[PDB]
Symmetry: C3
Subunit: 390 residues, 3 copies
Amino acid sequence: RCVGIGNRDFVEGLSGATWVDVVLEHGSCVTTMAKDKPTLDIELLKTEVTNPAVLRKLCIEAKISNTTTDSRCPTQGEATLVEEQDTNFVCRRTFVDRGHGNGCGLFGKGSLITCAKFKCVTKLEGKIVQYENLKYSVIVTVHTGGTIATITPQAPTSEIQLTDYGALTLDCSPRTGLDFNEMVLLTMKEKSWLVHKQWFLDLPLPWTSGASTSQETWNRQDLLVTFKTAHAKKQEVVVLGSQEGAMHTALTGATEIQTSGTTTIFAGHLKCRLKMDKLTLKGMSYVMCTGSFKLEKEVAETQHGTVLVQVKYEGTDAPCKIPFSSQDEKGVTQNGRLITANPIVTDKEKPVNIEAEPPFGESYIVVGAGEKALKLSWFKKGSSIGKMFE
Amino acid sequence: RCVGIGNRDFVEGLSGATWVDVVLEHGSCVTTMAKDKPTLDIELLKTEVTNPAVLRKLCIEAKISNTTTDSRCPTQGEATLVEEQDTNFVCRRTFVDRGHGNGCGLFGKGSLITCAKFKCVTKLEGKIVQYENLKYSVIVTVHTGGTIATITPQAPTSEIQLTDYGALTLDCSPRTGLDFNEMVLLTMKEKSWLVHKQWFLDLPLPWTSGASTSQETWNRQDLLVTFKTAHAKKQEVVVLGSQEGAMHTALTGATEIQTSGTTTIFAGHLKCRLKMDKLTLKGMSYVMCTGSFKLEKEVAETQHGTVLVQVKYEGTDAPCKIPFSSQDEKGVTQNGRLITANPIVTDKEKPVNIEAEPPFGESYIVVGAGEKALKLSWFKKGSSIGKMFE
Amino acid sequence: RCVGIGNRDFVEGLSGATWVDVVLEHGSCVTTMAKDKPTLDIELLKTEVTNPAVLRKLCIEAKISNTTTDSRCPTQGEATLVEEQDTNFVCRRTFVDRGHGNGCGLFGKGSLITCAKFKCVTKLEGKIVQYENLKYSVIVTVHTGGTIATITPQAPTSEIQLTDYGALTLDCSPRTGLDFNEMVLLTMKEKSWLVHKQWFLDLPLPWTSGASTSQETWNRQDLLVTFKTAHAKKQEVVVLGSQEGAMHTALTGATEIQTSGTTTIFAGHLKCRLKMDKLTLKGMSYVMCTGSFKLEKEVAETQHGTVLVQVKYEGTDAPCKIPFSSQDEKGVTQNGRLITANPIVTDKEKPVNIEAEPPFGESYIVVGAGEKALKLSWFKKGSSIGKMFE
Ligand SMILES: *[C@H]1O[C@H](CO)[C@@H](O)[C@H](O)[C@H]1NC(C)=O
Ligand SMILES: *[C@H]1O[C@H](CO)[C@@H](O)[C@H](O)[C@H]1NC(C)=O
Ligand SMILES: *[C@H]1O[C@H](CO)[C@@H](O)[C@H](O)[C@H]1NC(C)=O
Ligand SMILES: [Cl-]
Ligand SMILES: [Cl-]
Ligand SMILES: [Cl-]
């Protein structure tokens, strides 16, 4: 089930160490073997974002109460409320017609001030992922017939004592893919999504910093509050309805994700350098597949420029290297754009996942060789930060 | 024309692979050779940013129309327009003197509301560069007397089958230089620039999100709209002129760039790891140049802390290694700050480009050795995010 | 005093080079030795941020002057000042009661406009750290009984000529820790701190871009200016007091830092690749310590997910490798989370600094082996962007 390490991915020093390159991906596992020693398997078990920090909190459903109004006759100066100085209250000033009909001696404009207590009933949260929030669990197994390493951005190294092999240093790092400098973790009610950062920051909803506070204070309350037309001595303040639906629609397309509590699981990807004592490894070679491939399921599209292609092999020469190729709208082989490190059919009955990064516009993906090749036309749209929240 | 790979930049494993480090730069090309095999050349052909996402769109020239006004006599309540609820319209409320002279029974303040339809005639766009937007074209050539690899951040690897050499893995990554987390791609009319991100975001112009929408809706329209003084029953709304000139001036200094359509060409820089089967390479050594150097052209200054120095050799010992040195305001040799990987005069008649990163403040650049050395004094100003848009 | 390089951290090529991995940390130094040659020591001397760019400037103490007011009788139209068009002035409009008592013929609302000249007396500054702002000084010493290399993000390489050893290429990069894409350099009066970026940007203080300008122009002046109640012909404008105290309190917890002039010193961390000609190095092995450890001082907590643990060894087998382990709230050994590259007691009388990255929530740190182990319970709180400025 594991892909063997080719001899192009390690060097045994005349003196010193044996250095090995391996790429760990969710599902796949990598294996190798030394001059008369047990088999060695490495595998990425999971990837977790834990306790990310809140950037802001936005309010999608507010309520109104304690509506207070103060009015003054034309010759009685400017109205005033003490809740003007209260930050839980949203206020509004104006001048209304006053006269004999409502207790005044002069027909004319009288001052009016109206304040109402704002409260966020339903809020969402945008959380930024930092180095300290990311974690990987890598399992290393010596086949005497397993040790789970913990890898993080700040702590990428993990020294482990193995049977027969000795000390093994796991020097791993996250592969280039998701960018947490750009993408943000949005959480509304129960569901969660990965959304661009500025898109979030520009959302026209009442917001409050993620900073630590005892007094939740909102900004842009007007966005959910509507001061109806004022009367001589009173004025109604109403509030917009829940904006959960308007958001769900604006989030259409944005990648949805699973998070239980303060933990969010990802499909991680690691590039690792294995350091062990001077040792002659047994490299594993794979001949190119010669048979046919069938698309076990539809070509899936990620939100950061890639596509996932799962295929099934119909040939008789497994294990073998899946021939892959990409061609722009006009039949130019790109000699690249293959993201998967180990595109190997290790088992004929097991489907093989293939990630690739098509050119922008029209193109063609090709898995297999010759006339027996699976040819698929793909259109890739320019980048976008998301859909407008209306 | 290609710089030979020194023996300090590769290791032939007792077993396993031959690993090679090479730095590809626009113009330069790197070469090496094995125990009785053809010459091998690598070269970076181009670097493209394609279909970057819009952050915001700013309006530098707006127009006004459908100016509508509604006024009310002192005793007739608050004026009102239905375009108050229309987002294409920019509105403004006030109270104007009303009386017998304009149809009213009382001399006094009458309400007034004026709305005008806002339209962006000329806009600019700020676009963020993500991993999925970057692409490199690297050509690998075996001198039997060429294969073009595609390298991207997410797909840095490229396996290629060569004649005599066999499979060759290109594991390349962008060198540290331009930071697309900080710099933004600004596009006005036809010209384009690299500008800091917050500088852009703080621009005092009407703006609209880059998010997908059918209804272009602007924010901060007031910045280009001027409500003239109101009269009893009417009020003129005028609009500022094109701000293309005010921007051109504020962009003075900002790096200008060439982009045809959705593609922007850069002068890229790659650090690459070449993986091939166990093989004894022929390292290339270069003695330090002993002759003189002339500045073919003026020392150019980049906008991210570097300077480009092109020189021409007057000596007789090419190919040779250009002696380079940097000294702060007080003659301290820095033993670094040389960005170019291969500072080699491979051809006496070809000028050699040299990138370096001077200290801040006064300093001295020195190319060549001894009394025959080219000595240049350089002042480097502290970092800035750009010039204030006035 | 230097930690010896293990044989797992270098490879001598059958042909080509000897490649060596070393991690340089403030305080520590690394050493190695070749087949009959002098000892080689490497050490990180300092890390400097120099001339970082200003993002914005915020005003914590403003003053008011040139307060000008213009009022008009009910039948005399809308007041007006020429300083309305002046950006140094903060203005405010209203309607005040006018009548016989103050020169008017009609009792009614008269227009009023008040402008005051705003000036920032005390300001702070938020500065972003870019690649061009970072610098490292690494010293390389051949023990004949030293050469200082300059390392920067854009210029990570440094070729150096050594005695007996020959040319030595320092290929160093900053270890993953502080993120200058997220953290900002705040400077108020004399003290300085590392603060999150959005926290800063959302600060409710008057602000002005860091862009180059001759005319300092502020935004959100209202935040420090208070227009008192207006009278017929006059109106006082007052200003808030210094907000240095409100900031000091909001900065509580934020890491304080030392900066003389335009330079800020950090406790840097480098991972380096040493390239030298084919050479057989003498690897250094360290047996696990068997004795006891005492906490020379209290467990310190960084603001990016780590903790610093300094211990002192009570055993008799130095130099030795400090046994380290981490366990989550329920006794699960993590097989990682150790940040320090060289956890070695090279000298019994010298305390040893140990950086580690605990899990979130409750956990246990363990230094030493067996019953002689130092067991410490640690609680790690979720990430935060800072404390609310009130
Ligand atoms: C008004 O709301 C309730 C009355 O329903 C009252 O008990 C409360 O004290 C008031 N709140 C404020 C802050 O005015
Ligand atoms: C006003 O503009 C034109 C008249 O020039 C008219 O045809 C159009 O329907 C009006 N637009 C709106 C939205 O008021
Ligand atoms: C007002 O301030 C001083 C008077 O103290 C005067 O000299 C100055 O010219 C005035 N400034 C402005 C811009 O009004
Ligand atoms: Cl009435
Ligand atoms: Cl009149
Ligand atoms: Cl009066």
